[PDB]
């Protein structure tokens, strides 16, 4: 069962209006994830919304955000061919494998913070970073998916969730992120959540008091970094750019200081990939238009896939 250049393999998620199939690209043999979406049943507002996500997926180009590779589209159906993070969610990972040494925890936090910062540079995020947004790929690299998206086209309140959200106030930016980001680190480095309890009333009591103990192996840099994230009043919280500069963030990176992400100049002329595509049947004009005009068609999708994994 194929769509376009993709052999569809197992289903990995159904949701109301979307189905994510794992798949293999028959030209290059890359594994990808294909989100199949019925568009026949969509009121105009769901359609407007569908197409906004698509625009955003189109511009997110980051080594730690899931890439979009191809859009194949009929009157009835939208297929979005996207990067596959084979490794699950980061919270599960920790629950399943325990804490990480600071060095691995940093590499992952670096990727996270940079991806979250970058999203903000690129669109306006209207909802909180969520556990289901933090994935790992086959090589333990972070990949953020759908940051700030509705879950219409997805497939009480969380332990990993700003204290002021337990006050009912809507998401207001890199401010709520910072708290979440603090819970991530706490767990990344300690294996356990910084706040918990039996039920809604223990969790909330705990979170809003915001006391936590650190484990004795956590380094002072790390504890210090945490003192900038897990902070009750949202205005006392470090900005993302300010977080990037923290000491713990840069241990081992004293030359390569963490910095807001800037997209490199895109390479549309990789001669290796082009030679392969010419051997495959594609024309050099075809490759180039596809690339410069970002069509997300069979051709552009091929050149991208030839560049990974």
Swiss-Prot record:
User: Can you give the residue ranges of the Protein kinase domain?
Assistant: 6-249
> Which residues belong to any copy of the UBA domain?
263-308
UniProt effect for mutating residue 171 to C: In a gastric adenocarcinoma sample; somatic mutation
Q: Where does ATP bind?
A: 12-20, 35
Catalytic residues (positions): 128 (proton acceptor)
**Places the protein is found:** Cell membrane; Cytoplasm, Cytoskeleton; Cytoplasm; Cell projection, Dendrite
Give all Phosphoserine modified positions.
Answer: 157
Tissue-level expression reads: Highly expressed in heart, skeletal muscle, brain, fetal brain and fetal kidney.
Give all Phosphothreonine modified positions.
154
The signal sequence is none
PTM note says: Phosphorylation at Ser-157 by GSK3-beta (GSK3B) inhibits the kinase activity.
Q: Subunit details for this protein?
A: Interacts with MAPT/TAU.
Function field = Serine/threonine-protein kinase. Involved in cell polarity and microtubule dynamics regulation. Phosphorylates DCX, MAP2 and MAP4. Phosphorylates the microtubule-associated protein MAPT/TAU. Involved in cell polarity by phosphorylating the microtubule-associated proteins MAP2, MAP4 and MAPT/TAU at KXGS motifs, causing detachment from microtubules, and their disassembly. Involved in the regulation of neuronal migration through its dual activities in regulating cellular polarity and microtubule dynamics, possibly by phosphorylating and regulating DCX.
**What is said about the domains?**
The UBA domain does not seem to bind ubiquitin and ubiquitin-like and might play a role in regulating the enzyme conformation and localization. Activation of the kinase activity following phosphorylation at Thr-154 is accompanied by a conformational change that alters the orientation of the UBA domain with respect to the catalytic domain. The KA1 domain mediates binding to phospholipids and targeting to membranes. Binds phosphatidic acid (PA), phosphatidylserine (PtdSer) and phosphatidylinositol 4,5-bisphosphate (PtdIns(4,5)P2).
Any further remarks?
Phosphorylation of MAPT/tau by MARK1 could play a role in early steps of Alzheimer disease. Pathological aggregation of MAPT/tau to neurofibrillary tangles, filamentous structures consisting of paired helical filaments (PHFs), is one of the hallmarks of Alzheimer disease. Hyperphosphorylation by MARK1 could be the initial step for this abnormal aggregation of tau in Alzheimer disease and animal models of tauopathy.
> What family does the entry list?
Belongs to the protein kinase superfamily. CAMK Ser/Thr protein kinase family. SNF1 subfamily.
Disease link? Genetic variations in MARK1 may be associated with susceptibility to autism. MARK1 is overexpressed in the prefrontal cortex of patients with autism and causes changes in the function of cortical dendrites.
User: Which protein, by its recorded name, is this?
Assistant: Serine/threonine-protein kinase MARK1
Q: Which organism is it from?
A: Homo sapiens (Human)
Encoding gene, per UniProt annotation: MARK1
């Amino acid at each position: 069962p194929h769509i376009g250049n993709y052999r569809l393999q197992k289903t990995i998620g159904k949701g109301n209006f979307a189905k994510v199939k794992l798949a293999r690209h028959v030209l290059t043999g890359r594994e990808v994830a294909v989100k199949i979406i019925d568009k026949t049943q969509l009121n105009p507002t769901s359609l407007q919304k569908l197409f906004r996500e698509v625009r955003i997926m189109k511009i997110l180009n980051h080594p730690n955000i899931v890439k979009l590779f191809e859009v194949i589209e009929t009157e009835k159906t939208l297929y979005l061919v996207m990067e596959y993070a084979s490794g699950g969610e980061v919270f599960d990972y920790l629950v399943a494998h325990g804490r990480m040494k600071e060095k691995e925890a940093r590499a992952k936090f670096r990727q996270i913070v940079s991806a979250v910062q970058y999203c903000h540079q690129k669109y306006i995020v209207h909802r909180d970073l969520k556990a289901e947004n933090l994935l790992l790929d086959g090589d333990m690299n972070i990949k953020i998916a759908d940051f700030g998206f509705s879950n219409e086209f997805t497939v009480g309140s969380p332990p990993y969730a700003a204290p002021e959200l337990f006050q009912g106030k809507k998401y207001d930016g890199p401010e709520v992120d910072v708290w979440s980001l603090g819970v991530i680190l706490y767990t990344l480095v300690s294996g356990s959540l910084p706040f918990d309890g039996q039920n809604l009333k223990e969790l909330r009591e705990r979170v809003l008091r915001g006391k936590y103990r650190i484990p004795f192996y956590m380094s002072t840099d790390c504890e210090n970094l945490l003192k900038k994230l897990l902070v009750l009043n949202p205005i006392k919280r470090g900005s993302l750019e300010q977080i990037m500069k923290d000491r713990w963030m840069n241990v081992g990176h004293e030359e390569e200081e963490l910095k807001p992400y800037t997209e490199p100049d895109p390479d549309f002329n990789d001669t290796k990939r082009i030679d392969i595509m010419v051997t495959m049947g594609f024309a050099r004009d075809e490759i180039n238009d596809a690339l410069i005009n970002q069509k997300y068609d069979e051709v552009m999708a091929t050149y991208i896939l030839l560049g990974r994994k």
